Design an enzyme around this catalytic site. Structure first.
Site, PDB file in Angstrom:
ATOM      1  N   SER A 285       0.852  -1.192   0.000  1.00  0.00           N
ATOM      2  CA  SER A 285       0.000   0.000   0.000  1.00  0.00           C
ATOM      3  C   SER A 285       0.890   1.245   0.000  1.00  0.00           C
ATOM      4  O   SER A 285       2.106   1.150   0.192  1.00  0.00           O
ATOM      5  CB  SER A 285      -0.899   0.024   1.241  1.00  0.00           C
ATOM      6  OG  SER A 285      -0.104   0.114   2.421  1.00  0.00           O
TER       7      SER A 285
ATOM      8  N   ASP B 256      -0.972  -1.457  -4.031  1.00  0.00           N
ATOM      9  CA  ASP B 256      -2.370  -1.292  -3.639  1.00  0.00           C
ATOM     10  C   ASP B 256      -2.819   0.179  -3.788  1.00  0.00           C
ATOM     11  O   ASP B 256      -2.039   1.027  -4.248  1.00  0.00           O
ATOM     12  CB  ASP B 256      -2.519  -1.766  -2.181  1.00  0.00           C
ATOM     13  CG  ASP B 256      -3.926  -2.252  -1.830  1.00  0.00           C
ATOM     14  OD1 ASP B 256      -4.811  -2.370  -2.708  1.00  0.00           O
ATOM     15  OD2 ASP B 256      -4.173  -2.524  -0.634  1.00  0.00           O
ATOM     16  N   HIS B 257      -4.078   0.457  -3.417  1.00  0.00           N
ATOM     17  CA  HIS B 257      -4.767   1.763  -3.600  1.00  0.00           C
ATOM     18  C   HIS B 257      -3.874   2.985  -3.822  1.00  0.00           C
ATOM     19  O   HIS B 257      -3.205   3.458  -2.903  1.00  0.00           O
ATOM     20  CB  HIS B 257      -5.702   2.080  -2.420  1.00  0.00           C
ATOM     21  CG  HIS B 257      -6.723   1.024  -2.139  1.00  0.00           C
ATOM     22  ND1 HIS B 257      -7.985   1.038  -2.693  1.00  0.00           N
ATOM     23  CD2 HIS B 257      -6.673  -0.073  -1.345  1.00  0.00           C
ATOM     24  CE1 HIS B 257      -8.670   0.001  -2.244  1.00  0.00           C
ATOM     25  NE2 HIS B 257      -7.891  -0.697  -1.432  1.00  0.00           N
TER      26      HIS B 257
ATOM     27  N   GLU C 136      -8.427   3.289   5.725  1.00  0.00           N
ATOM     28  CA  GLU C 136      -7.223   2.820   5.070  1.00  0.00           C
ATOM     29  C   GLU C 136      -6.224   3.905   5.072  1.00  0.00           C
ATOM     30  O   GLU C 136      -6.282   4.835   4.301  1.00  0.00           O
ATOM     31  CB  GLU C 136      -7.469   2.271   3.700  1.00  0.00           C
ATOM     32  CG  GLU C 136      -7.535   0.806   3.697  1.00  0.00           C
ATOM     33  CD  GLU C 136      -6.733   0.174   4.811  1.00  0.00           C
ATOM     34  OE1 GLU C 136      -5.522   0.116   4.703  1.00  0.00           O
ATOM     35  OE2 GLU C 136      -7.304  -0.233   5.820  1.00  0.00           O
TER      36      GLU C 136
ATOM     37  N   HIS D  97     -12.855  -2.399   4.341  1.00  0.00           N
ATOM     38  CA  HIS D  97     -11.501  -2.668   4.833  1.00  0.00           C
ATOM     39  C   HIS D  97     -11.580  -2.836   6.345  1.00  0.00           C
ATOM     40  O   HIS D  97     -12.232  -2.032   7.027  1.00  0.00           O
ATOM     41  CB  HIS D  97     -10.588  -1.492   4.510  1.00  0.00           C
ATOM     42  CG  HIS D  97     -10.161  -1.419   3.075  1.00  0.00           C
ATOM     43  ND1 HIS D  97     -10.200  -0.244   2.351  1.00  0.00           N
ATOM     44  CD2 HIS D  97      -9.686  -2.367   2.231  1.00  0.00           C
ATOM     45  CE1 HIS D  97      -9.738  -0.467   1.130  1.00  0.00           C
ATOM     46  NE2 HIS D  97      -9.428  -1.746   1.033  1.00  0.00           N
TER      47      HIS D  97
ATOM     48  N   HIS E 149     -11.841  -6.736  -2.528  1.00  0.00           N
ATOM     49  CA  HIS E 149     -11.202  -5.938  -1.462  1.00  0.00           C
ATOM     50  C   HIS E 149     -11.852  -6.183  -0.104  1.00  0.00           C
ATOM     51  O   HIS E 149     -12.978  -6.679  -0.008  1.00  0.00           O
ATOM     52  CB  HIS E 149     -11.197  -4.429  -1.776  1.00  0.00           C
ATOM     53  CG  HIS E 149     -10.165  -4.027  -2.783  1.00  0.00           C
ATOM     54  ND1 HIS E 149      -9.069  -3.246  -2.476  1.00  0.00           N
ATOM     55  CD2 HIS E 149     -10.062  -4.310  -4.106  1.00  0.00           C
ATOM     56  CE1 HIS E 149      -8.332  -3.076  -3.559  1.00  0.00           C
ATOM     57  NE2 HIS E 149      -8.916  -3.709  -4.562  1.00  0.00           N
TER      58      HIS E 149
ATOM     59  N   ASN F 299      -7.896  -9.479  -1.689  1.00  0.00           N
ATOM     60  CA  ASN F 299      -6.922  -8.744  -0.887  1.00  0.00           C
ATOM     61  C   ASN F 299      -7.138  -9.078   0.582  1.00  0.00           C
ATOM     62  O   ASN F 299      -8.279  -9.060   1.067  1.00  0.00           O
ATOM     63  CB  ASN F 299      -7.100  -7.230  -1.090  1.00  0.00           C
ATOM     64  CG  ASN F 299      -6.669  -6.734  -2.479  1.00  0.00           C
ATOM     65  OD1 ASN F 299      -6.524  -5.515  -2.685  1.00  0.00           O
ATOM     66  ND2 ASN F 299      -6.464  -7.643  -3.411  1.00  0.00           N
TER      67      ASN F 299
HETATM   68 NA    NA Z   1     -12.509  -6.741   5.695  1.00  0.00          NA
HETATM   69 ZN   LIG Z   2      -8.437  -2.586  -0.595  1.00  0.00          ZN
END
Ligand code: NA
Ligand SMILES: [Zn+2]
Ligand code: NA
Ligand code: NA
Ligand code: NA
Ligand SMILES: [Zn+2]
Ligand SMILES: [Zn+2]
Ligand SMILES: [Zn+2]
Lengths: 345, 345, 345, 345
Positions: free
Chosen positions: C52, C94-95, C168, C211, C251, C273
């Site tokens: 990430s 990632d993102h 996140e 998430h 996700h 993920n």
């Molecule tokens: Na989760």
């Molecule tokens: Zn994610």
């Protein structure tokens, strides 16, 4: 057994004559009382168990919060336990300032007076009047009438001149020059109360004492203050210059240097109060228990814990034994170990 | 106040009549007694405080280890405390097997007989005889003579038929078919002791009970055993089929399903014993305290710790309050909350 | 070995054809990379390791805090390690939102373009463009040019339509209706990018994903959104109604119900993920280590600790092994276990 | 940047000329490398990062356990990171005994020889041959051929005469008289290898050194051994009596008295190894984190924990910063702080 007033007076006389002292251990519970008495017994020593205002409030429980109730309940518990040990155990109450006299020392005195009136012995064998926060003359005026009441109930009064530094409950005393007792305060004490003949008393004369445990050596004791107080009093009384008319009480005992304790014993200290060090000794194995058994004392990851280790007895037995060891150390530091007046040996 | 024998009998009668029960909380100390009574008070409920053989030994301290001493000391403590609460508190002793009768229940009975002979009330209001490990006929023979002694001292006897599974102190009982009481055992009980007219008694008839806390639902209770026991007894006594001649005691209360408690209440349970769950409640905030204050309860990296957090009162007050909350829960589970016979409301 | 672009495309094709998926495990360090690859190997599975923006910043160290540096450093570490395992390991980022493209995905793309220009393979095998916070048309405009650059560097682009709920890094997305992707967004995606013929891409279409790890069942997934997206696309493309033109990315995998994973696999999810669950698995034995070795990891009561237990390897090996176990679980949940394209078996 | 061989030689020359030394910090991971380099940077100092045999095995992961793989992977990671710091960072390998030469130092040497053959610089800038467990003549025979290989790859060789006490990995060396290097060993070293003109080398001559951290003062260092070794060598070489032909390496640096470090610097120590103290510094805040966040790092009482605190970055950032502080302390103890040869100041 519980010390009778006659045995308690003999204890203090023996300590004074032979330059040793007894530990006075603050307790708050059945477990801490048990730990203290076992410490005395393991050391072959007599000793004193004391309840502070906050300790007594705690002993009464959160639903009551009454100092008299807690002190009486813990005292009654202690009378049962102490009967099963060969050593003598005296019960005492710690620092009681002016605004708590009517809700602690006075009602406790009245309870003991009633017992004595029926031909019995007092519930407690000594009580502390702490008037250090008021001017010396007021302190001693209150002391004189309390001493009359105490003596009538076969109880020894402890009084305080000078201030003990540090935190005792919510309240802090500044560490300064007021921690050192003045010669005039020594003189006024003898004038007001005599030297035992108007009632037996103990004198908490401060010489730099601080409640609590700071880095070793940070607290600066001046035991010479005590030697001079004895000289001052012997002069007033027309005694030889090496006479020791005062029975001294050493407050803030925890964290003291061994050399400081040894010196104080030479000047007539017969009682040293210990609280903070026995608190650490009690708690230390509890901490260790929780950490090493973390997954038994907590219900983790969907498990239900382990009763064997969350049973309060599992860690409280360890707490008891550790506090008892620290009390044995106090008896050896104060030279009362192996000297119990029961000579059960 | 402490329950007088007359108030205790009234308590149980009210519970029986109205299909509710009292918690009987195992305690081991001043702190646990205080927590239990505060729980009762917070719930506006009467309640029972009980000492096991191991709890009493613990209460006497490591230097004594005497069941009678510990039970008497804790009882005397409890008498002082309970006087300051509006609710009624009954004192009880838990599981006493055959080989401990002479060193627990019998001497305690003798102490109460002496008090009664002087015109006073008994120290304890009930005692448990647990003869589940001996054949039913021997169990009831001992029960009959103990019941005579107990009634003469104004004390209720609790007896047990069938075995409670699990670990109670060092000893484990296998979880099997013996956990379920037989009809004949119900019948022999009535034949031997009657239905109150030869002395008041409580019956711990087991119906799958297990001491301790296992994953919810793992312990398989069969409350129907109790309903059938009542029917068996009503038949022997020539009472209507819906009569409830037994006052039942629910052992192994901790970890039980709420539905299981509700069902048992319908069949005449008047007392449910709780120990393991209140142990977890007491210990849980102590664990949290040590972890979150790790650098205050331990002297780390040359520092001297933090007295505010190693003072035993700091975490034991949290322990007390948490155990009291669990006792409030028990009072609401058993439907005795808000029903104290003092109606102080 | 590290997955070549050709092997990575084969991996995804096999997963798609056989209705299984690969775990994409967020890593932050040498230890977490090692744990992930060992998990893949133990499961006989290929897999994906992803960094990430925050993970890359962390990997670069507190003195650098540069996403490109951290991702490159961890990637180079991973290339050395992965060569020693029989399974194929793909590297992913990632993102990456709009404001971080110029300092993460774009410079990383440029690094891989340079390697490819010299006849080599890209450093990373896929990169994520997360434009979910901007309107769909802008998201896809950026996606189209990034896809051209990525395909030219032999790299697969992951894009996102719809928002993933939860936290996140420092930023939280509200859990609402935006978590569910619209049919028009599915349609615009196909219009803009085609179905592979203008560059290979993965589609993170959100269907209630959050998430983090909440109580099981609190997060409400709607895998049917994916089935309908496939139908929408097959219609646009003139394919049979059971065609699956999208390669989907799941996700917020941690904490998902097993039934939810199983359903998603039926609709063309080829990548799930996992971060939060592997974080818990890594940390859990570290916590246990510190508690059970509290007096070794801390210098207590004047002692100097115990190197054997404060050596970081002592607890980090435990962390590694525990995280690897959780990765094995992911491979078995996603049905890629035992299917590595190396067939080292 | 990574130290080129030319910059590394300049570093050591400057240290020697000015009676200062560099810390050589054992690392095992991305986090520990990052912590070490940030420490150097914060101190405005050059420094050395070293991997032990066990550290390299750990760095390769539990699925590989290959020293060469771990050292190469961590080295490649370090090359990327060090490029972003103004200070010079040299890479080194620690204690390699005879039975590990073929699986550690030799293959690493071969890798660097290959890079140099293509016109590049070596991967590592120094390697340690530890032959202290074999007789001096065998030790130096191996040293001579390794020195030729090392010099050809632009690498400095560290060798050891005398034994370092204590535990280094699974193996313990007895703390005895063998910890003190003999004059003949000093003499044989010069005879075998010269004084730099046959290849540059560092000499770990032991003077009571012990790996690990014992109570301050328990380890008895004799830095005079080094002064005499210099005198012995200057005599052999026909130099003035105050010449310092050896570049010394101080093993077992952690836990040393500041006065012992100061003395050793006067006799030509240019490198002091630190591992145990930086391990404690790294772990200490991790321990604190787990305790103060116990209910976040563990899923307790049916809760799901708190990701913010079980995210490994949350405590590992604290670990990094604490280890960096200890490295800053080492730079100030060794007088290399503020002296980086980049003079970025
Ligand atoms: Na989760
Ligand atoms: Zn994610
Ligand atoms: Na003190
Ligand atoms: Na139970
Ligand atoms: Na050392
Ligand atoms: Zn005091
Ligand atoms: Zn029971
Ligand atoms: Zn070394």
């Amino acid at each position: 057994p519980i010390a009778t007033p006659e045995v308690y007076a003999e204890m203090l006389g023996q300590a004074k004559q032979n330059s040793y002292a007894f530990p006075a251990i603050n307790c708050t519970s059945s477990e801490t009382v048990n730990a203290a008495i076992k410490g005395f017994a393991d050391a072959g020593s007599d000793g004193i168990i004391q309840f502070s205002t906050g300790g007594a409030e705690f002993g009464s429980g959160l639903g009551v919060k009454d100092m008299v109730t807690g002190a009486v309940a813990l005292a009654e518990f202690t009378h049962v336990i102490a009967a099963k040990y060969p050593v003598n155990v005296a019960l005492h109450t710690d620092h009681c300032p002016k605004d708590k006299l009517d809700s602690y020392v006075r009602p406790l005195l009245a309870i003991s007076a009633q017992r004595v009136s029926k031909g019995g012995n007092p519930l407690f064998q000594s009580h502390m009047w702490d008037g250090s926060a008021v001017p010396i003359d007021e302190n001693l005026a209150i002391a004189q009438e309390l001493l009359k009441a105490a003596a009538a109930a076969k109880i020894i009064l402890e009084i305080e001149i000078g201030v003990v530094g540090g935190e005792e409950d919510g309240v802090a005393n500044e560490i300064n020059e007021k921690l050192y007792t003045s010669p005039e305060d020594f003189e006024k004490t003898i004038e007001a109360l005599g030297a035992g003949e108007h009632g037996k008393y103990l004198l908490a004369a401060t010489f730099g004492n601080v409640h609590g445990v700071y880095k070793p050596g940070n607290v600066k004791l001046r035991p010479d203050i005590l030697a001079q107080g004895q000289q001052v009093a012997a002069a007033k009384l027309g005694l030889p210059a090496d006479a020791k008319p005062f029975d001294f009480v050493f407050h803030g005992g925890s964290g003291s240097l061994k050399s400081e304790i040894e010196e104080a014993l030479r000047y007539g200290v017969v009682k040293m109060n210990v609280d903070t060090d026995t608190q650490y000794a009690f708690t230390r194995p509890i901490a260790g228990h929780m950490f090493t058994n973390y997954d038994g004392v907590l219900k983790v990851d969907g498990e239900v814990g382990v009763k064997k280790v969350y049973d309060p007895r599992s860690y409280l037995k360890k707490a008891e034994a550790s506090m008892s060891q620290r009390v044995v150390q106090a008896c050896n530091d104060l030279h009362c170990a192996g000297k119990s007046l029961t000579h059960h040996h």
